[PDB]
Amino acid sequence: SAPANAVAADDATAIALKYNQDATKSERVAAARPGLPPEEQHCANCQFMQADAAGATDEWKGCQLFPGKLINVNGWCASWTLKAG
Numbered sequence: 533s534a535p536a537n538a539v540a541a542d543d544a545t546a547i548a549l550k551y552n553q554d555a556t557k558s559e560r561v562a563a564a565r566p567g568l569p570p571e572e573q574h575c576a577n578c579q580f581m582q583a584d585a586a587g588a589t590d591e592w593k594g595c596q597l598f599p600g601k602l603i604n605v606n607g608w609c610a611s612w613t614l615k616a617g
């Protein structure tokens with residue numbers, strides 16, 4: 533069900549980013565980045581999400597910091613930045 537080009541939790545990029553699909557387990561609540569309450573924070577409302585990304589699907593879109601691979605919209609990383617436009 534996850535794409536082959538899913539971001540791996542153990543990607544070097546993901547380790548650096550502290551990317552996690554499991555937004556409940558995610559450091560987001562601990563980190564409490566400014567923008568919107570941690571519970572709201574995920575790739576879904578991240579400035580850097582790329583839903584245009586080739587091979588994007590239901591729960592699975594791109595992220596600027598994760599080219600070629602797809603993050604899960606539900607997930608979060610330390611770089612999470614509030615959806616502008």
Ligand code: SF4
Pocket residue numbers: 549551574575576578579580581582594595596597598603607608609610611612613
């Ligand atoms: S930058 Fe945003 S979209 Fe990308 S992985 Fe982090 S939280 Fe998700």
